[model samples]
Target: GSGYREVEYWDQRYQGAADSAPYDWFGDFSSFRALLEPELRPEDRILVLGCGNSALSYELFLGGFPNVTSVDYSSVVVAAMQACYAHVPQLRWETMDVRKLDFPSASFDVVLEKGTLDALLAGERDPWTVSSEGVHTVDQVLSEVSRVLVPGGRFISMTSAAPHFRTRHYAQAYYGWSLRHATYGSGFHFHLYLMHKGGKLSVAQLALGAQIL
Candidate 1:
């Protein structure tokens, strides 16, 4: 078992950085502004899955974009964000799993995955216990993403890539969507992948062409 304990491992880490600044790669809007705004709108329904102790919801609210929901499966992390920000109207914080999402299909205008998928795949310490109840892998979560997002809705995620990247990378390649932007540091990389369901169904075309032949 490698002496692994999931909740304790993550809880200790979160407790360590209870007062630290948000994500390092994503410093603030000033760094990712030009690239992020093109995909987000003021009135869009934005989702931030696995939002750790980051003040991302606070930043987004200050940016004037309302209707944002930030979730963390870990109540410990959620509590940290809540305590840090106190009263931020732009954010609706929840402790929920991304795989078995609470929202309906085609519910939000934008779905955000900020390094949540990588942790699930790498298993943190114990992969067995970190199971998503059959919805852990990023590919499977993408299936849910494709279903929950509207025809033209956007799915954006800044996740860890390389030296550990696994499931979500496959989803990115399988879906064949475009990478709007990407940046890497040391043993980690962040990619901005967008999902455009309305963009012609090329995967279906390939399958149908084979069927016809």
Candidate 2:
């Protein structure tokens, strides 16, 4: 909660850390596979934002999820990961700013965020503001995610943030996204958000389209 949202901060961290094992942050793949593997397909184009030095991407690739691309703002760590996993062509690593992605619209079928939004939310005032008032890092990233995802695509976020805060910000009208599914990880404070892009009914729309079976 005390960290800054600067790339240099993360760079120094990963630069000084040991290379024995990449920090999983939330836990290993087993903790998320249940929520992820069901919705993910082998052919789906996936993007993992703020991929820091985590082994999540490798875990995904090794689990038959070959079409995965990971990005991080820290060039130092990106280079480290690229060199370390150079043998794995299934995984692609790049240096990128999550708030300002360089991809085209409707680019990927799925986007995964693991602790990235929380990192951005740290030390911000009113971290859940829907409008462009101040400290809109999460808002900007959401906009980019929605823009880059195709209709019916899903943005999956695994965060430590409370449901009230996440649901509030994500369910805002301006994003045109909805909380299609939410489930808490077993025995932990971790929450998984399955936010769908277009082609879904909103609460108001559902209220109008409501029908008794």
Candidate 3:
């Protein structure tokens, strides 16, 4: 599982906050709710990637989306969330490689990625290193996402703009999606990019893609 070494790296990074208060990004949910919630329905299914020790999936459950699942490749992070939100029944937690998800096609209404893509992009050093084996190639990640999201589903990602040291991209790019909303603003991260599916895609993108890598 050498490919999963990044998971172990972050598991240790998050060990310090295994029992801290709600994460800073948790509060930023309101920002998304104000703009994105209006477009969603009660039956919508949701997923949160690299959720860390945050309770965002459970928060969305309380907000009325009954089907909510959060995932992290790191077991430590997953365990912390399981303990923190153990009381909530609707939220499912898993520690698995997101490059190949277990869900069916068009299965979810929304997927949220924040600060997770960076983990994927970490080990890469220079241009010669880009490939399927590297995080930045983003092929496997995008393919899985495209396969899982329904045609009309939406994805929202928040990350740093290019010079994004981790992923090494300069601007937001969609491989199988269309830009719904793109903004340069303030939050726990820098760039806030949104996309939707169902219509003809302007680019080749995936549904379960990561944030940093």
Which candidate has the highest TM-score of all? Answer: 2
Model 2, range 1-213, lDDT digits (tens) per residue? 436567778988888433546887765678879888998988899999988878889898888889889999889888888887888988898899988989999889999998888777766555444324223666678889998888878899998776656665566555566675555565767888887776454675344222210
Which candidate tops lDDT? 2
Q: Under the 3 Å rule for N, CA and C atoms, how many clashes does model 2 have? A: 0
lDDT by residue (tens digit), candidate 3, 89-200: 6788898677777787878878777666645654555633444556443556566666778877877766553322323331234445665444444644455656666443
Q: Tens digits of per-residue lDDT for model 1 on 1-213?
A: 321224466666677455777654334445555657777889988888877776666777888887888887778877777777666655788888677788887788888776666565543444323344323355566766767777678877665443123322333334434334355333324455555655533443444323212
Q: TM-score of each candidate?
A: 0.71, 0.85, 0.73
Give the winner by TM-score: 1 or 3.
3
lDDT, candidate 1, residue 103?
84
Candidate 1 lDDT at 188 equals 28
The whole-model lDDT of each prediction reads: 0.61, 0.77, 0.62
Better of 1 and 2 by lDDT: 2
Collision count of model 3: 18
TM-score of 3: 0.73
Q: In candidate 1, which residue ranges exceed 4 Å CA deviation?
A: 1-7, 16-20, 23-28, 123-136, 162-189, 200-213
Q: What is the lDDT of candidate 1?
A: 0.61
